[PDB]
From a paper:
Conserved residues map to the cap-membrane interface. They include two catalytic histidines that function to effect unimolecular transacylation. The reaction involves acyl transfer from the sn-2 position of the glyceryl moiety to the amino group on the N-terminal cysteine of the substrate via an 8-membered ring intermediate.
A hexahistidine N-terminally tagged variant of Lit from B. cereus was over-expressed in E. coli and was crystallised by the in meso method with monoolein as the host lipid. Two structures were solved; one at 2.27 Å, the other at 1.95 Å. Monoolein molecules from the mesophase in which crystallogenesis occurs coat the protein surface recapitulating the native membrane and occupy a volume inside the protein. Notably, two structured monoolein molecules that derive from the crystallisation process reside with their glyceryl head groups coordinated with the two conserved histidines. These lipids are considered surrogates of the DAG moiety of the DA-BLP substrate and serve to reinforce the view that they sit proximal to the active site of Lit.
Author numbering: -6 to -1, 1 to 210
Amino acid sequence: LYFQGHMDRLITLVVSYSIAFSIFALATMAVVYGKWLYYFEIDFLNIPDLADMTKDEIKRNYDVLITYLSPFYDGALHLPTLDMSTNGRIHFVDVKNILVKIQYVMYATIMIAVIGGIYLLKKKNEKFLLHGSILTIIFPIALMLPIAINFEKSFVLFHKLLFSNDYWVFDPEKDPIILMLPEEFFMHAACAILLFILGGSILCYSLYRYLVKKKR
Ligand SMILES: CCCCCCCC/C=C\CCCCCCCC(=O)OC[C@H](O)CO
Ligand SMILES: CCCCCCCC/C=C\CCCCCCCC(=O)OC[C@H](O)CO
Ligand SMILES: CCCCCCCC/C=C\CCCCCCCC(=O)OC[C@H](O)CO
Ligand SMILES: CCCCCCCC/C=C\CCCCCCCC(=O)OC[C@H](O)CO
Ligand SMILES: CCCCCCCC/C=C\CCCCCCCC(=O)OC[C@H](O)CO
Ligand SMILES: CCCCCCCC/C=C\CCCCCCCC(=O)OC[C@H](O)CO
């Protein structure tokens, strides 16, 4: 009992951070691989005007690129309409590699938390559900203002942090897909992620309080 205390409490520690990360990764893949937001973006930002492309050309290029970024696509990236340089296809491999590593870690934290969670959950201990929501709502709270007021510079730091080359700044001449990827769209995608993080936090917290009311 002196040791089930710690071990259950280390599992509530390990499980808690894996709840936070799993929500982070899940919200990312939902926004990254979701095409509903970007399809709305095409008319809302008037991307045809921005890129001198048609609504059909923009959709298929985005369709092909999003398909290229899945773990289960082993082919190279060829855009239906736009040409691209070797620097351009190095960046999308960088982006593809980042997504794959987040997803690999995400499966671990999703399993760690579901398996280890139900262990502590059926053992009448829900401390991990409060800690999880607190840890994961730190994300939107810390980053809501950086995106809202300083997106352009937060965007650069983000890229500088995650990429070890210069190729993330696209030359419209050699990589014209940058014209159909406006900065406002990535800003909305960052907001959608944070809303899903915040949504998952509230969801995770709704359970905690609801479960604590069960014990009493
Ligand atoms: C079995 C009786 C109750 C069932 C509970 C099973 C126990 C699962 C344990 C830990 C994970 C719980 C996570 C709390 C809920 C979070 C919901 C979620 O993970 O979704 C995040 C969303 O996908 C982000 O975009
Ligand atoms: C029931 C658990 C609740 C968790 C909810 C789903 C869990 C699915 C089950 C197990 C491993 C986790 C896999 C989930 C990851 C798949 C979603 C994802 O991010 O994949 C993107 C895909 O590659 C874009 O093409
Ligand atoms: C994970 C614990 C520490 C978190 C610290 C990181 C802060 C990032 C915050 C929000 C963005 C979340 C995005 C997750 C990864 C983005 C996927 C990606 O590669 O995007 C490429 C980019 O759009 C090409 O311009
Ligand atoms: C009950 C809990 C209350 C809520 C808990 C707070 C946590 C933050 C949640 C979401 C913020 C994330 C998205 C916020 C960023 C939106 C961007 C924005 O609104 O600014 C527009 C932009 O400046 C135009 O130029
Ligand atoms: C600073 C925090 C904000 C960081 C951004 C939030 C994450 C955006 C994620 C998905 C949007 C849709 C992305 C789908 C794939 C985009 C293709 C791409 O990587 O283009 C990047 C561009 O070339 C480089 O400037
Ligand atoms: C009730 C629980 C609430 C939390 C659960 C949320 C789940 C769905 C949230 C958002 C979907 C995507 C909407 C993203 C819209 C991006 C635009 C934005 O949020 O702010 C940008 C601003 O408009 C710049 O001018």
